[PDB]
Amino acid sequence: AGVPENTSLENIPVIVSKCREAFNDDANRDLKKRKQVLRSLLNLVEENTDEFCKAIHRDRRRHRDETVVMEILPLRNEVWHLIEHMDEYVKPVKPTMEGAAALDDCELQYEPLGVVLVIGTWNYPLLLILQPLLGALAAGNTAVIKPSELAPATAELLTKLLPKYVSSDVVGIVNGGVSETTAVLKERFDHILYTGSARVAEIVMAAAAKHLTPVTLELGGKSPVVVDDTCADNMKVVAERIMWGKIINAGQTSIAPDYVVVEKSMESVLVDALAEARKAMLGDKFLKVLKGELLVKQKQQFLEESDYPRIVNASHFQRLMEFMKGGKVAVGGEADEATLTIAPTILTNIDPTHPVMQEEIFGPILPVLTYENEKDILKIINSREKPLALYVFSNNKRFIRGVESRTSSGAVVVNDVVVHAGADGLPFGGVGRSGMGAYHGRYSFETFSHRRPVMRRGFLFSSIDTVRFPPYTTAKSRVLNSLL
Amino acid sequence: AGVPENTSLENIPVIVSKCREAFNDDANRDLKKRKQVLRSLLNLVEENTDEFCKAIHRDRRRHRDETVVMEILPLRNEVWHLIEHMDEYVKPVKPTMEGAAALDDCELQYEPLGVVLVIGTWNYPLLLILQPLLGALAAGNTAVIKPSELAPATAELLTKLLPKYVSSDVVGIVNGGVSETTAVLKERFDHILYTGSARVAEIVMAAAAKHLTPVTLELGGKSPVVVDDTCADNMKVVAERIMWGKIINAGQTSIAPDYVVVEKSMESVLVDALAEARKAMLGDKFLKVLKGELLVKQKQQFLEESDYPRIVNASHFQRLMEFMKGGKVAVGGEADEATLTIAPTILTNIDPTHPVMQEEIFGPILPVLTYENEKDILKIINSREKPLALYVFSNNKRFIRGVESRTSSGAVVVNDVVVHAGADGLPFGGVGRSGMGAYHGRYSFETFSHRRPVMRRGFLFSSIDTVRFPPYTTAKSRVLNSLL
Ligand SMILES: NC(=O)c1ccc[n+]([C@@H]2O[C@H](COP(=O)([O-])OP(=O)(O)OC[C@H]3O[C@@H](n4cnc5c(N)ncnc54)[C@H](O)[C@@H]3O)[C@@H](O)[C@H]2O)c1
Ligand SMILES: NC(=O)c1ccc[n+]([C@@H]2O[C@H](COP(=O)([O-])OP(=O)(O)OC[C@H]3O[C@@H](n4cnc5c(N)ncnc54)[C@H](O)[C@@H]3O)[C@@H](O)[C@H]2O)c1
Ligand SMILES: O=Cc1ccc(Oc2ccc3c(c2)COB3O)cc1
Ligand SMILES: O=Cc1ccc(Oc2ccc3c(c2)COB3O)cc1
Numbered sequence A, B: 001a002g003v004p005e006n007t008s009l010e011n012i013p014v015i016v017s018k019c020r021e022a023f024n025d026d027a028n029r030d031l032k033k034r035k036q037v038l039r040s041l042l043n044l045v046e047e048n049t050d051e052f053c054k055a056i057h058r059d060r061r062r063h064r065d066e067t068v069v070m071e072i073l074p075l076r077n078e079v080w081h082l083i084e085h086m087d088e089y090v091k092p093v094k095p096t097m098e099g100a101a102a103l104d105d106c107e108l109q110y111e112p113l114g115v116v117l118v119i120g121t122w123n124y125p126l127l128l129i130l131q132p133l134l135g136a137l138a139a140g141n142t143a144v145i146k147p148s149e150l151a152p153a154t155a156e157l158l159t160k161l162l163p164k165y166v167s168s169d170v171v172g173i174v175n176g177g178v179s180e181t182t183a184v185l186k187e188r189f190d191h192i193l194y195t196g197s198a199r200v201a202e203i204v205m206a207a208a209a210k211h212l213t214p215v216t217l218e219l220g221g222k223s224p225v226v227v228d229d230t231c232a233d234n235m236k237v238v239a240e241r242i243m244w245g246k247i248i249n250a251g252q253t254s255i256a257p258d259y260v261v262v263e264k265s266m267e268s269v270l271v272d273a274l275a276e277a278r279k280a281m282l283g284d285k286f287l288k289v290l291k292g293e294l295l296v297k298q299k300q301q302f303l304e305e306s307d308y309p310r311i312v313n314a315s316h317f318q319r320l321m322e323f324m325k326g327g328k329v330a331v332g333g334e335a336d337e338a339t340l341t342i343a344p345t346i347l348t349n350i351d352p353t354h355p356v357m358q359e360e361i362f363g364p365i366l367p368v369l370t371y372e373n374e375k376d377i378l379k380i381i382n383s384r385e386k387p388l389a390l391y392v393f394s395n396n397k398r399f400i401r402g403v404e405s406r407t408s409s410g411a412v413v414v415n416d417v418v419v420h421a422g423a424d425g426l427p428f429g430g431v432g433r434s435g436m437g438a439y440h441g442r443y444s445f446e447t448f449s450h451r452r453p454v455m456r457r458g459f460l461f462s463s464i465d466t467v468r469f470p471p472y473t474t475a476k477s478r479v480l481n482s483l484l
Helices: A011-024 A031-047 A049-060 A063-082 A086-089 A099-102 A127-138 A150-167 A178-185 A199-211 A232-251 A264-282 A283-292 A299-306 A314-326 A374-381 A397-405 A441-445 A476-482 B013-022 B031-045 B049-060 B063-086 B085-090 B099-102 B127-138 B152-165 B178-185 B198-210 B232-251 B263-281 B286-290 B298-302 B316-327 B372-383 B397-405 B442-447 B474-483
Strands: A105-112 A115-119 A142-146 A171-173 A192-197 A216-218 A224-229 A259-263 A329-330 A347-348 A365-371 A389-394 A411-414 A449-456 B106-113 B117-118 B142-146 B171-173 B191-195 B215-218 B225-229 B259-261 B328-332 B346-350 B363-370 B389-392 B409-412 B449-456
Touching: A011 A115, A011 A142, A011 A178, A011 A441, A011 B127, A031 A049, A031 A127, A063 A127, A063 B474, A086 A232, A127 A142, A142 A314, A142 B215, A150 B286, A171 A224, A171 B117, A178 A199, A192 A199, A192 B389, A192 B474, A199 B198, A224 A374, A224 B474, A232 A264, A232 A365, A232 A389, A232 B474, A259 A264, A259 A374, A259 B372, A264 A365, A283 A299, A299 B232, A314 A347, A314 A365, A347 B298, A347 B328, A374 A397, A374 B152, A389 B474, A397 A476, A449 B178, A476 B063, A476 B152, A476 B397, B013 B117, B013 B171, B013 B178, B013 B298, B031 B049, B031 B085, B031 B127, B031 B152, B049 B063, B049 B152, B063 B085, B063 B127, B063 B215, B063 B232, B063 B263, B099 B346, B106 B298, B117 B127, B117 B178, B127 B142, B142 B178, B152 B171, B171 B346, B191 B198, B198 B397, B215 B298, B225 B372, B232 B263, B232 B363, B232 B389, B263 B286, B263 B328, B263 B346, B316 B346, B316 B363, B328 B363, B328 B449, B363 B409, B409 B474, B442 B449
Parallel strands: A115 A142, A115 A192, A142 A171, A192 A216, A224 A259, A224 A389, A259 A365, A347 A365, A389 A411, A411 B449, A449 B409, B117 B142, B117 B191, B142 B171, B191 B215, B225 B259, B225 B389, B259 B363, B346 B363, B389 B409
Antiparallel strands: A105 A449, A329 A347, B106 B449, B328 B346
C-alpha cells in the first residue's frame, strides 16, 4: 500500500499499441460512446469523492474542502460542460469567404487526432490528470495517462478505480518516474499534453519531434501581483485574496502569487493586511505551535493533523528556507523540518538578483518589491520570463489598461487571483516559458481536434478558369497583365 | 551573380539580436506601423513583379503567367486582406461565460509573440517566404526569413530588394543551406514557421524544444485523388483539373495529385481523358520533340525555352525516372537529363509496395490504382500517412460524405484540386506528418499571436466567497457537501 506498481518497460508499448487499435477500431468515435465514457468518469469522481479526498490528503495534507473547491467541483463542471456542448462543438463551421472561393460551398469540420498522452503533476493530482483526459475523450480520441509519482497514493487509487469505469484500451495507464516516462515518450501519439517544469518540457518536446507530435505544454514562472495606490479602502479584500491564493497547497500552485510589486506609499498597509489575513486563515493555535510560543505534547503529530498543507519533499523545503536569507522576514518565518511545514512568509528589502527573485518559488515565500512609477513595474516584469498569470489590484482604468498593454502573460486578472483558472469559457494556458497551447471546455476540444477545411465545387464554369489552364497564350498574358 | 552571399555564422546572432531589440523597442506594435510595412511589401511585390518572374524562371523554369496565378496574385490578395481586416483582428473578443465568472467582465485579447523565424522552400520561392512574413508582421511581430538555397536567384533578388522597402531590424535575412540554417535555429525565437520535408521538420522541432518555441510545420505526403463512377459525363473537366494540378511546376507541389484511386469501371476513360488533357496543355510540338518523333537543331536550347518547368536537380530527376519501373507506362514516359525535363507520366499495374507508392512523388509521375468498394479506398489511404490534401471527384452526396468521415487529411476538396490553397477564409495546413498548425489571412494572424485571457473583478461580495477562504469550518463543509 501507499504507491502504484511501476509499469514494466515491456508493457509500455503493449499499452499504447492497444489504444492505437481501439482508436483505429472506432472505440470512441460516435457521440453516444463519448458521452457514456464522459458519464462513467463523472461516476468515477462522484461515487469516490470521499476516497479521493482521503488519498489527496495523504499525498498533499490538503483539507477535504480545499480539495472539493480546487479539484472535485471543477472536474464535475468540466464533465457537465462537455456533455452539454458536445453537439455544438462537433458541428461544422461556415467560415466567411472572400474573393473567388465565395462562390463555392466551404466548411470547417472537426475530426479526432488519434491517441493522446497526458503527463500529470503532483500538486493537484486528480484535476491535472483527468481534466485533460475529459477533453481528449470529448474530441473522439483514445488516451494514455501518466500520473505524477510525487503523488503516489492518488496515482494508486486512480489506477485501482479508473479501469472499473473505463476500459484500458480506451484510457491506458502508465505509472513511474523518469524511466517509465522516457519509455512512453518513445511511443507514437497524435497529441501530448504536459504539465510540469520548463526544464522537463524541453525533453518532452524533444521526444515529440521524433514523431512530429503536437504538444500542449502547461508550465510556470513567477506570476506577479501589482498593487497600486487606488486600493486603500479595499486593502482587506486585496490582502485576503492574495493570502488565500498563496496559503492553498502551501504555495505550490502555478498560478499563485509568487511576488508582489506594491506602490511605494502602500507597502506598510498591504503587508500588515496580509499578516491579519494570514492569521485569520491559518488560525491562532496553529501558528503559536509552529513558532514554539505554545507547546503541545506530540508536536509532529499535531502539524501532520492540521489544516495547512505540506511541502512535497525535503529538497524543496530546504530550497525554500534558503530563500528566507534573500531578505528581511517581515511577516512569518516559521518552519518545521520533519513535517515539511513552512508557514507563509513575507520578505522585504529584497536583493532583486537573489535566487528567490530569479526562479519560481512554488512555496509559501512571498517577496514584496516596490515601484515609484509604471516603468519600474515593466523592468521588473519584462526582464523575466513571461509568466502564466499576471494580477493587478487597482480601481484606475488607465493604470490597468497600461499594464495589460505593456506586458505579456498567460492570463490577466484584475482584483483577484487564481479563480480565472476555474472560469467557464476562458482558455487556460501559458506563453513563452509559461507554455504553449490552452485547454478547458471548448479549448480542450479545439486542442484535441484537427480543424479540417472542406471545399465543395461543381463542374460548371467559374472566374478562375479564364486564367489557370495552359498553354500560356499571349491572350492569357494580356488578361493577367490587366489585373496587375 | 546567380546566388546570394552565404551569411557569416558570426553575423547570425547579430541579425537575430537586432530584431529582438526592434520588437522590444515597439518597432512594429502600433497599427499605423504594421500597415506601412504591409504596404511597403505590397510595393516590393507590385513594382518588381517583372524581375521576380524572371528570377523564378531561372530557378524553376516556370512561365510568368504560371507564376502570376500561383505566387504574385495570392501574395497581393494576402497583403490586401490583412490591411483591410487588421482593425477587426486586433480587437478583443467577449467569450461566452457560464456559471460564476459570468458575473465578471471577461475578455480575450490578442498580443504579439515577439521574433518570428520563417524557413522557406524552393518550389514556390517568393509565395512560401513572404506569405508567412505578411502574417507575422500583421500580428505585431518582427521577423527573420531564411530563403531556400535551392532557389538561389529568387533568394538573391529578394535579398537585394527587401531592405530597400523594409529595414533589416524589422525583417532580418539569413542565406545559406544546412550550416547557416543550423546556426539560426540555435537562436531564440517566439514562433518558427517551417515549410519543407518531415525529415527536416523533426530537426527544426528538436531545435525549437531547446527554447520551447512553438512551431507551425507545413509539410507533405501523398495527396490522393478519388474518382468514382458518377462523373462519366464530366470526365473532361475531371481530367483537365487533375492534369493542370500535376503539370504546374513539373508536379513539385505539395498539394498536387500524387496518385489516383479510380472506380474499376472508369479506369480507361479517365486515363485517356488525362492524356487528351496533357496534350492540350503541353502542346504537340513540345511532346514530339521530347519524345524524339520531331527533331530540332538545338534540342537542349528548345527545352530550356519551353513553357514546361524543370526538376530541381539531377538526384530528384533520377529518383523520378526509377519510379517509372514500378509499373506500366500507360501515358507519357518522356524525359531529357541535361534540361531535367520529365513530362507527366501515368502508370498502371502498380506494385503498391514499390517506392513510387510509399514515398511522396513530388514530380510528374502519377500512379493510377483502382477500387471495387469504399473499403479498398480506405485501406489504401488510411494505411499511409495523413496527407496535406484529399480530393474527391463525385456527384454522389453519400459517397463524398462517406469518404470525408472515414479519412483524415489537411483539407478536402470535392471536384477540383489545389485551389483551396488560394481560397480566402480557410486555414492552410497539415495534420500528422503533413504538419501542424495553419496559416493564411485570419489564421496567420491567429498563429502569430498569443490569445490572452483577461478577467476583471470588482471588490464586492460574490458567489465564490461563500466557500473559498479558510479556516475550514464545519459550516463550510456542510455547504460544500450540499453541492455534491
Ligand atoms: N499551468 C499549469 O496547469 C500547471 C499546473 C501545475 C503545475 N505547473 C507547473 O509545474 C512546475 C514544476 O512542477 P514539478 O517540477 O514538480 O514537475 P515534475 O518535475 O513533477 O514533472 C511533471 C511530470 O514530468 C515527469 N518527469 C520528470 N522528470 C522527467 C524526465 N526526465 N523525463 C520525462 N518525464 C519526467 C514526472 O513523472 C511528472 O509526471 C511548477 O513550476 C508549476 O508552475 C503548471
Ligand atoms: N504544405 C506546404 O505548404 C508545402 C509547400 C511546399 C513544399 N512542401 C513540402 O516540403 C517538401 C519540399 O522539399 P524539400 O525536401 O526540398 O524541402 P527542404 O529539404 O529544402 O527543406 C526546407 C528548408 O530546410 C532547410 N534545410 C534542409 N536541410 C536542413 C537541415 N539538416 N537542418 C536545417 N535546415 C535544413 C533548407 O535550407 C530549406 O530552406 C516536400 O515534401 C513538399 O511536400 C509543403
Ligand atoms: O496550479 C495550477 C492550478 C490550475 C487550476 C486550478 O483549478 C482551479 C479550478 C477552479 C477554481 C480554482 C482553481 C480556484 O477557485 B475556483 O473556483 C488550480 C491550480
Ligand atoms: O506546394 C505547395 C503550395 C502551397 C500554396 C500554393 O499557393 C497557391 C496560392 C493561390 C492559388 C493556388 C496556389 C492555386 O490557385 B490559386 O489562385 C501553391 C503551392
